[PDB]
Amino acid sequence: QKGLQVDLQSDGAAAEDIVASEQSLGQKLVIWGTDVNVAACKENFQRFLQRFIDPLAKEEENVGIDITEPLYMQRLGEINVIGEPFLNVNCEHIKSFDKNLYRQLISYPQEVIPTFDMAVNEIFFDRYPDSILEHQIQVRPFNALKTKNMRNLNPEDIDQLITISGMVIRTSQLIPEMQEAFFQCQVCAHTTRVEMDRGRIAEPSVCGRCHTTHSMALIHNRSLFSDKQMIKLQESPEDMPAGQTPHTVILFAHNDLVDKVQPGDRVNVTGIYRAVPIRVNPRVSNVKSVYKTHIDVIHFSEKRVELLKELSRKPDIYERLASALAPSIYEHEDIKKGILLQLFGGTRKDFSHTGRGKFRAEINILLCGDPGTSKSQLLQYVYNLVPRGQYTSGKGSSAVGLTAYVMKDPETRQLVLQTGALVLSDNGICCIDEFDKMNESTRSVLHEVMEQQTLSIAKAGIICQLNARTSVLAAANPIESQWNPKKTTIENIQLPHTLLSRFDLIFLLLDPQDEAYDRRLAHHLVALYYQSEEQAEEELLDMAVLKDYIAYAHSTIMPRLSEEASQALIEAYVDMRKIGSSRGMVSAYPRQLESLIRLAEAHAKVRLSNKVEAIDVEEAKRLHREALKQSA
Amino acid sequence: GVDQSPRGMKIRGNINICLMGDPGVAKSQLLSYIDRLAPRSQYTTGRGSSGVGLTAAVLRDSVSGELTLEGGALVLADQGVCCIDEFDKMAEADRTAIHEVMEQQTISIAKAGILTTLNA
Amino acid sequence: EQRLQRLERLPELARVLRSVFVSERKPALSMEVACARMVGSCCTIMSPGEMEKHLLLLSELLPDWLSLHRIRTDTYVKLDKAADLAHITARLAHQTRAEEGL
Amino acid sequence: DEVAEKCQKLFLDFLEEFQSSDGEIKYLQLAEELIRPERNTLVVSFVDLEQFNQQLSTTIQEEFYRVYPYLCRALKTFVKDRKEIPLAKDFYVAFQDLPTRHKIRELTSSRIGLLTRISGQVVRTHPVHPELVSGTFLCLDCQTVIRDVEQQFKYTQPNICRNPVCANRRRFLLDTNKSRFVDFQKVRIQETQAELPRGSIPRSLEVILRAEAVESAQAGDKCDFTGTLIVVSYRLVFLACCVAPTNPRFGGKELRDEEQTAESIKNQMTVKEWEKVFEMSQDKNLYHNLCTSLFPTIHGNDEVKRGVLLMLFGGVPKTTGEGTSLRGDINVCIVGDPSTAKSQFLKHVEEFSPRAVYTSGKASSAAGLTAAVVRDEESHEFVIEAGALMLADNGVCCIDEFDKMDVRDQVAIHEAMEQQTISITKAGVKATLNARTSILAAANPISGHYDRSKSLKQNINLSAPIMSRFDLFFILVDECNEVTDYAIARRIVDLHSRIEESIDRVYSLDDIRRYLLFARQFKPKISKESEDFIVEQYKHLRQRDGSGVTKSSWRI
């Protein structure tokens, strides 16, 4: 938009008295429609680039920029060397300098952002006037101080700087948008740059020297275009409400911002919440009563880390955290003991130099029992706390509909792909029930998801190989929902041998008929049945520590094997092979050997130590030993 | 019973009762009386209509561009009495959704897209 | 022995690296983004593991033809593309004869 | 403009000053062919133009759409001095030989007017269609014929007629014998599976070639088109010029299509590829040292390492007396592992050899990988779409889990291991092609493990017609001794503890790919002392087949 400036003086009179001195007749000029003047906003921004000192700036992140010296004074020699004339200015630095300029940028970023593009050019010419680039230096403000949602969009926030973080599902193709028009005369040679601002189409009927109507043909092959990438984004899963589906806002990206945000990441979108009337007919100027809400995209503390390190040295942290996942059942701690190590998994390693690049270090736990007795709380509690959890139904959803399938789409004239549920929870945890009565076609597609970590689907002329991987848990059930001592554990599980062998541990919900067994289970649920909320926050820690305990070791401590603690894995592998009695000479595959290494990496990750000793190795084989006696 | 949801989790509640009997032993007297007795209880039986219109009725709303899923006996009977006859005659898909709406009374809908939790 | 085949590509890469910086229209760039930009542009069937090796054993011999430094993210690589190849080839040929004469 | 005129006068002198091999110019022999009006070849080398001028060739590739009519009038004037030509036929610049290649994912908004080169491969094939270039209209208002009507990218109509009184603001009339057309093909390219390391977003791009660029354009060409991207409602189209079918991505320039002598290949290859394949080819353990240097994570089992190396080479597609090519490729498959350790055998080949696919049982239906047929949505015509077996020509296709599949898919692939061709005529649409792709199958037992009580034919699902058309058949050796698990466990510890340090290969992967093209050069022959040794060894396996009386298990 190119708006004019209207002076705010008395119409019809030049100056009513007031000699020499300037009383109420100074610089009252301002843009008509905005309380931001170019002659006033530019002067307030030049001092922001010269008189701004941030002593609290770090050195590992601001390499090349001095801390004591002004930061923006050293950035003059950085824009002309990176190639692209686009300066990255953080909105947090503006509030710490002037509070008046910070409120004018967010309230109306339509004329303040273009004003900043002309102030940097004046300072850049006073330092390196010889170094030139493509077009001019533009300012891309990002990282605001507002965190709202699509439902809290007040009607007073129209055409303002709103920053809402989310997750991008999929992106569109490339839609060229012709900006400046280009024409060529059919008689002479003359170029004309017609500004097609505000979505207007017009062509001049008078040439340069020919001066003949209908003699200047249009050529749309030498003008400047711009790709229009339609990016969709909804509410972030970490701050979304429960009980309703989130709203998706359409995002636009032009210039160099096209193909920058990959679909499937969590990038803070900083744009301007604008609104344009939908044009029904491109010929006749029609205005729709329902506008289109579009947003033009522009671009831990130390009080909690020290508390997590003190608990790592305590030898009781592994027992306190394992009992926090049992809010009702007192016993049966060995069932949920392996679930705590599932969120950690282990540090993923790369071996592309030997022909084996992809490798997953996640732990897959296998459960079995009655779906409702003791498994009703272990399927809905790991979904509300963990933000990377995706719940889905087995029988309610199709086999190919859960993953990434192919579906017709006559809108884009291309057989595009669609997302699912487990393909979005990468590096997290997937939630899925009903594994004993699941579909036959669904069991077949799981032979390469959690095994090969590469979903290769080549059908209907669609060559696509997905690289999504996520630890999936299961909860089986016998043919009679009860253990039968007359038959072995092999006949009870109806799953084939190739399916149960891909899982690590194995447990089973047993209900003994002992009289003394109810003395330690029935006397516990009644004690907490009449008690309200006068003991939950007194004898048990809060849930705010568990969410912050796993968000630190997953990107700081990378444990690895050594030379002494790794020798115990060979001797323990030979002893667990000649089992017999139950099934026979089995367990002769590198499956249980690979899963045993994942158990040692998960135990050392909770202890906050990259060095793995022989203590954590003895604890890995102890969990596998209890799984054998449970199913026998 | 008690509906306070302590210790983070949610305890059980709502009285449950099952009855087996041939539909014809004056069962309508025990059903029509309890239907008008409870303020939030609609007269729904096992027959009279299709099985995909009383517990899983999908309505394709093309006026707004969404996808909803309603029932007929467990979507509008909050803190009331759910009246239904012939508990063992429908398909297995209709009896699977009862595993979560009966214990803690939480409607779980997850058919690839519809991600919501109804409270009834 | 890991750089013997690299010295043979010096008269070959002198003409390939000259055209890839002109057709891209972009003046200056970096080496971090070069792992996914010019990795498929230069006609080299060798593994990408040795792609960051020719950017150090060539600019240090001729600092005038290519001047750059190292940091941690988005470096500043400036290649003098305004020089004729009639004299650049004679400059890189001085160090080539010294390698085969050892 | 005077800028475009300066780039044409100096370019005219380049065809006479810059020499080629001797004291003759390569364009001199090309001028003798342009006299005959049926061939218009104007090949211009870019690696040789920079030797005479560098700053002049910068504006040529930067702004090519504007200098398009200037190249047609400059080359026509230069050839006029050689010999007088008629004034009734135009030409077309055939600029090829570009050492710079651009990726399909590397594009912005100012890619128009840039003379670059795009890689990839074409799948769909469309027939030829003319294009109005030099036409002649006729005003229906004053009955006047207007000549010299050039059509660019829109409907260029004469807004002002010859009579300066009125004009025709509607439609005209297409001339008959006074309109020159140029046919083209609207093929559909596709991203290559060997250049997408991250992200799986398949798409295509409109490619339009010239008149003489036809013929050599069929479903299965891995060529790289060269031209300039043109912007059209508002769509995208890459105006190509010539074709050059070579190896995927980079690679060599000779395989099984062009044959020459041994003295002309040494002048094109590098000097580092001579002594490497000379002193190492005289060893005695060359067939064994290449097995451990490629699979360091596999301990023992020498029967699976010596068959994967021979899978890439194998036999050659010969020709019978009547002129019909039969077999010429080796096939192998393993069985005896419930997809626990055989998965690494297909991954090492997929990363190494770029001409390979990867799929499972349920991921491949009846067609898809062979030849899919579906009616087009914007043309309404039964087309033929290539599969995965046609893109991996002269290579090897991978497939795992041979159990979760029906019976209709095995019937449609029976002509792959015996005839190595695709003959699908569906709907009166003939589509008979050929592909020399070996099937790297991997059978899976019924109960997961090999049952010792049942017979050897009761543990697999493969019948007799399937195994008869297949070549080599291996079975994974299963040993239940205390020394088997004691030796394989030591290799796992050294791999997970010493990251990127357990590999001790004697030959790196850079020289293994170089020795792949030397095998397809000198074709070996058959000695006169070997015909008596083959006739005496087949009778041994003939009695080994009939263990009982006549038939038994594997038929040979």
PDB file of N, CA, C and O in Angstrom, chain D residues 73-112:
ATOM      1  N   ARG D  73      18.857 -15.140 -36.830  1.00  0.00           N
ATOM      2  CA  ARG D  73      19.281 -14.274 -37.922  1.00  0.00           C
ATOM      3  C   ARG D  73      20.794 -14.191 -38.063  1.00  0.00           C
ATOM      4  O   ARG D  73      21.282 -13.819 -39.137  1.00  0.00           O
ATOM      5  N   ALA D  74      21.545 -14.530 -37.014  1.00  0.00           N
ATOM      6  CA  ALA D  74      23.002 -14.480 -37.093  1.00  0.00           C
ATOM      7  C   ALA D  74      23.571 -15.743 -37.726  1.00  0.00           C
ATOM      8  O   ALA D  74      24.493 -15.667 -38.546  1.00  0.00           O
ATOM      9  N   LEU D  75      23.041 -16.912 -37.357  1.00  0.00           N
ATOM     10  CA  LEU D  75      23.519 -18.156 -37.948  1.00  0.00           C
ATOM     11  C   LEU D  75      23.072 -18.298 -39.396  1.00  0.00           C
ATOM     12  O   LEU D  75      23.763 -18.938 -40.197  1.00  0.00           O
ATOM     13  N   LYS D  76      21.925 -17.712 -39.751  1.00  0.00           N
ATOM     14  CA  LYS D  76      21.475 -17.752 -41.138  1.00  0.00           C
ATOM     15  C   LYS D  76      22.318 -16.845 -42.024  1.00  0.00           C
ATOM     16  O   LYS D  76      22.514 -17.143 -43.209  1.00  0.00           O
ATOM     17  N   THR D  77      22.825 -15.740 -41.474  1.00  0.00           N
ATOM     18  CA  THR D  77      23.680 -14.847 -42.247  1.00  0.00           C
ATOM     19  C   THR D  77      25.073 -15.438 -42.437  1.00  0.00           C
ATOM     20  O   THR D  77      25.683 -15.269 -43.500  1.00  0.00           O
ATOM     21  N   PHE D  78      25.587 -16.137 -41.422  1.00  0.00           N
ATOM     22  CA  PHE D  78      26.915 -16.735 -41.536  1.00  0.00           C
ATOM     23  C   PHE D  78      26.925 -17.872 -42.549  1.00  0.00           C
ATOM     24  O   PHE D  78      27.861 -17.988 -43.349  1.00  0.00           O
ATOM     25  N   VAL D  79      25.896 -18.723 -42.532  1.00  0.00           N
ATOM     26  CA  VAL D  79      25.823 -19.817 -43.492  1.00  0.00           C
ATOM     27  C   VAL D  79      25.533 -19.303 -44.897  1.00  0.00           C
ATOM     28  O   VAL D  79      25.793 -20.008 -45.879  1.00  0.00           O
ATOM     29  N   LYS D  80      25.008 -18.081 -45.022  1.00  0.00           N
ATOM     30  CA  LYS D  80      24.775 -17.504 -46.341  1.00  0.00           C
ATOM     31  C   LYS D  80      26.085 -17.211 -47.062  1.00  0.00           C
ATOM     32  O   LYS D  80      26.159 -17.341 -48.289  1.00  0.00           O
ATOM     33  N   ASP D  81      27.126 -16.820 -46.321  1.00  0.00           N
ATOM     34  CA  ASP D  81      28.423 -16.568 -46.940  1.00  0.00           C
ATOM     35  C   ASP D  81      29.069 -17.859 -47.428  1.00  0.00           C
ATOM     36  O   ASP D  81      29.796 -17.847 -48.428  1.00  0.00           O
ATOM     37  N   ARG D  82      28.819 -18.975 -46.740  1.00  0.00           N
ATOM     38  CA  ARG D  82      29.356 -20.258 -47.183  1.00  0.00           C
ATOM     39  C   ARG D  82      28.732 -20.681 -48.508  1.00  0.00           C
ATOM     40  O   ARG D  82      29.442 -20.989 -49.472  1.00  0.00           O
ATOM     41  N   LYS D  83      27.403 -20.702 -48.572  1.00  0.00           N
ATOM     42  CA  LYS D  83      26.689 -21.064 -49.786  1.00  0.00           C
ATOM     43  C   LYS D  83      25.311 -20.421 -49.748  1.00  0.00           C
ATOM     44  O   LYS D  83      24.690 -20.333 -48.685  1.00  0.00           O
ATOM     45  N   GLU D  84      24.844 -19.969 -50.909  1.00  0.00           N
ATOM     46  CA  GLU D  84      23.544 -19.320 -50.996  1.00  0.00           C
ATOM     47  C   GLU D  84      22.431 -20.306 -50.657  1.00  0.00           C
ATOM     48  O   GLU D  84      22.388 -21.420 -51.188  1.00  0.00           O
ATOM     49  N   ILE D  85      21.536 -19.893 -49.766  1.00  0.00           N
ATOM     50  CA  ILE D  85      20.440 -20.743 -49.305  1.00  0.00           C
ATOM     51  C   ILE D  85      19.114 -20.091 -49.682  1.00  0.00           C
ATOM     52  O   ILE D  85      19.047 -18.861 -49.817  1.00  0.00           O
ATOM     53  N   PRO D  86      18.045 -20.862 -49.870  1.00  0.00           N
ATOM     54  CA  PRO D  86      16.749 -20.257 -50.189  1.00  0.00           C
ATOM     55  C   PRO D  86      16.158 -19.533 -48.988  1.00  0.00           C
ATOM     56  O   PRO D  86      16.491 -19.804 -47.832  1.00  0.00           O
ATOM     57  N   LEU D  87      15.264 -18.596 -49.284  1.00  0.00           N
ATOM     58  CA  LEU D  87      14.604 -17.794 -48.253  1.00  0.00           C
ATOM     59  C   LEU D  87      13.180 -18.294 -48.015  1.00  0.00           C
ATOM     60  O   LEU D  87      12.193 -17.590 -48.230  1.00  0.00           O
ATOM     61  N   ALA D  88      13.086 -19.550 -47.557  1.00  0.00           N
ATOM     62  CA  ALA D  88      11.777 -20.137 -47.291  1.00  0.00           C
ATOM     63  C   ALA D  88      11.810 -21.165 -46.163  1.00  0.00           C
ATOM     64  O   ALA D  88      10.846 -21.926 -46.014  1.00  0.00           O
ATOM     65  N   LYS D  89      12.877 -21.213 -45.369  1.00  0.00           N
ATOM     66  CA  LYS D  89      12.982 -22.168 -44.276  1.00  0.00           C
ATOM     67  C   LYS D  89      13.896 -21.595 -43.205  1.00  0.00           C
ATOM     68  O   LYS D  89      14.999 -21.135 -43.511  1.00  0.00           O
ATOM     69  N   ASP D  90      13.433 -21.624 -41.958  1.00  0.00           N
ATOM     70  CA  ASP D  90      14.196 -21.098 -40.839  1.00  0.00           C
ATOM     71  C   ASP D  90      14.997 -22.215 -40.173  1.00  0.00           C
ATOM     72  O   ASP D  90      15.007 -23.365 -40.619  1.00  0.00           O
ATOM     73  N   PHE D  91      15.681 -21.869 -39.083  1.00  0.00           N
ATOM     74  CA  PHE D  91      16.485 -22.835 -38.346  1.00  0.00           C
ATOM     75  C   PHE D  91      16.164 -22.779 -36.858  1.00  0.00           C
ATOM     76  O   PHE D  91      15.187 -22.141 -36.451  1.00  0.00           O
ATOM     77  N   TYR D  92      16.981 -23.440 -36.041  1.00  0.00           N
ATOM     78  CA  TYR D  92      16.779 -23.458 -34.598  1.00  0.00           C
ATOM     79  C   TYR D  92      18.110 -23.744 -33.922  1.00  0.00           C
ATOM     80  O   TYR D  92      18.818 -24.677 -34.312  1.00  0.00           O
ATOM     81  N   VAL D  93      18.444 -22.940 -32.912  1.00  0.00           N
ATOM     82  CA  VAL D  93      19.715 -23.095 -32.215  1.00  0.00           C
ATOM     83  C   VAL D  93      19.677 -24.353 -31.357  1.00  0.00           C
ATOM     84  O   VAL D  93      18.754 -24.554 -30.557  1.00  0.00           O
ATOM     85  N   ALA D  94      20.680 -25.208 -31.523  1.00  0.00           N
ATOM     86  CA  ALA D  94      20.782 -26.461 -30.784  1.00  0.00           C
ATOM     87  C   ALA D  94      21.970 -26.386 -29.829  1.00  0.00           C
ATOM     88  O   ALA D  94      22.976 -27.082 -29.985  1.00  0.00           O
ATOM     89  N   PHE D  95      21.843 -25.525 -28.823  1.00  0.00           N
ATOM     90  CA  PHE D  95      22.907 -25.349 -27.842  1.00  0.00           C
ATOM     91  C   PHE D  95      22.907 -26.521 -26.866  1.00  0.00           C
ATOM     92  O   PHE D  95      21.934 -26.728 -26.133  1.00  0.00           O
ATOM     93  N   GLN D  96      23.996 -27.285 -26.856  1.00  0.00           N
ATOM     94  CA  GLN D  96      24.119 -28.459 -26.000  1.00  0.00           C
ATOM     95  C   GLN D  96      25.481 -28.405 -25.315  1.00  0.00           C
ATOM     96  O   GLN D  96      26.183 -27.390 -25.366  1.00  0.00           O
ATOM     97  N   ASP D  97      25.854 -29.511 -24.667  1.00  0.00           N
ATOM     98  CA  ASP D  97      27.125 -29.652 -23.956  1.00  0.00           C
ATOM     99  C   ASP D  97      27.257 -28.587 -22.861  1.00  0.00           C
ATOM    100  O   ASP D  97      27.984 -27.599 -22.982  1.00  0.00           O
ATOM    101  N   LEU D  98      26.521 -28.825 -21.776  1.00  0.00           N
ATOM    102  CA  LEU D  98      26.524 -27.939 -20.621  1.00  0.00           C
ATOM    103  C   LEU D  98      27.126 -28.662 -19.427  1.00  0.00           C
ATOM    104  O   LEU D  98      26.531 -29.636 -18.938  1.00  0.00           O
ATOM    105  N   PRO D  99      28.288 -28.236 -18.925  1.00  0.00           N
ATOM    106  CA  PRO D  99      28.885 -28.915 -17.765  1.00  0.00           C
ATOM    107  C   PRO D  99      28.176 -28.625 -16.452  1.00  0.00           C
ATOM    108  O   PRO D  99      28.464 -29.300 -15.456  1.00  0.00           O
ATOM    109  N   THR D 100      27.270 -27.653 -16.415  1.00  0.00           N
ATOM    110  CA  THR D 100      26.549 -27.295 -15.201  1.00  0.00           C
ATOM    111  C   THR D 100      25.151 -27.897 -15.240  1.00  0.00           C
ATOM    112  O   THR D 100      24.404 -27.685 -16.202  1.00  0.00           O
ATOM    113  N   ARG D 101      24.802 -28.646 -14.197  1.00  0.00           N
ATOM    114  CA  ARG D 101      23.501 -29.287 -14.078  1.00  0.00           C
ATOM    115  C   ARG D 101      22.772 -28.741 -12.860  1.00  0.00           C
ATOM    116  O   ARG D 101      23.374 -28.551 -11.798  1.00  0.00           O
ATOM    117  N   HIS D 102      21.477 -28.488 -13.018  1.00  0.00           N
ATOM    118  CA  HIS D 102      20.643 -27.956 -11.951  1.00  0.00           C
ATOM    119  C   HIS D 102      19.641 -29.006 -11.489  1.00  0.00           C
ATOM    120  O   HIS D 102      19.191 -29.849 -12.269  1.00  0.00           O
ATOM    121  N   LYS D 103      19.296 -28.943 -10.206  1.00  0.00           N
ATOM    122  CA  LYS D 103      18.351 -29.871  -9.608  1.00  0.00           C
ATOM    123  C   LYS D 103      16.926 -29.352  -9.767  1.00  0.00           C
ATOM    124  O   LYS D 103      16.687 -28.142  -9.817  1.00  0.00           O
ATOM    125  N   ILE D 104      15.977 -30.288  -9.854  1.00  0.00           N
ATOM    126  CA  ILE D 104      14.576 -29.911 -10.010  1.00  0.00           C
ATOM    127  C   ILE D 104      14.065 -29.191  -8.768  1.00  0.00           C
ATOM    128  O   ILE D 104      13.201 -28.311  -8.863  1.00  0.00           O
ATOM    129  N   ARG D 105      14.594 -29.531  -7.590  1.00  0.00           N
ATOM    130  CA  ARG D 105      14.173 -28.873  -6.359  1.00  0.00           C
ATOM    131  C   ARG D 105      14.828 -27.512  -6.165  1.00  0.00           C
ATOM    132  O   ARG D 105      14.410 -26.761  -5.279  1.00  0.00           O
ATOM    133  N   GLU D 106      15.837 -27.179  -6.969  1.00  0.00           N
ATOM    134  CA  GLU D 106      16.538 -25.901  -6.854  1.00  0.00           C
ATOM    135  C   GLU D 106      15.968 -24.946  -7.896  1.00  0.00           C
ATOM    136  O   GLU D 106      16.482 -24.825  -9.008  1.00  0.00           O
ATOM    137  N   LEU D 107      14.889 -24.260  -7.527  1.00  0.00           N
ATOM    138  CA  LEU D 107      14.252 -23.299  -8.414  1.00  0.00           C
ATOM    139  C   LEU D 107      13.551 -22.242  -7.575  1.00  0.00           C
ATOM    140  O   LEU D 107      13.079 -22.517  -6.469  1.00  0.00           O
ATOM    141  N   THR D 108      13.494 -21.025  -8.114  1.00  0.00           N
ATOM    142  CA  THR D 108      12.846 -19.913  -7.428  1.00  0.00           C
ATOM    143  C   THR D 108      11.781 -19.281  -8.316  1.00  0.00           C
ATOM    144  O   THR D 108      10.946 -19.985  -8.892  1.00  0.00           O
ATOM    145  N   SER D 109      11.806 -17.952  -8.433  1.00  0.00           N
ATOM    146  CA  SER D 109      10.855 -17.227  -9.260  1.00  0.00           C
ATOM    147  C   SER D 109      11.479 -16.540 -10.464  1.00  0.00           C
ATOM    148  O   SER D 109      10.744 -16.159 -11.381  1.00  0.00           O
ATOM    149  N   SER D 110      12.801 -16.371 -10.492  1.00  0.00           N
ATOM    150  CA  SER D 110      13.494 -15.729 -11.603  1.00  0.00           C
ATOM    151  C   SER D 110      14.270 -16.735 -12.448  1.00  0.00           C
ATOM    152  O   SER D 110      15.314 -16.405 -13.016  1.00  0.00           O
ATOM    153  N   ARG D 111      13.769 -17.968 -12.540  1.00  0.00           N
ATOM    154  CA  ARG D 111      14.431 -19.004 -13.323  1.00  0.00           C
ATOM    155  C   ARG D 111      14.174 -18.876 -14.818  1.00  0.00           C
ATOM    156  O   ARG D 111      14.801 -19.599 -15.600  1.00  0.00           O
ATOM    157  N   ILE D 112      13.276 -17.982 -15.234  1.00  0.00           N
ATOM    158  CA  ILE D 112      12.995 -17.811 -16.652  1.00  0.00           C
ATOM    159  C   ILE D 112      14.143 -17.066 -17.322  1.00  0.00           C
ATOM    160  O   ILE D 112      14.831 -16.242 -16.703  1.00  0.00           O
TER     161      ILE D 112
END
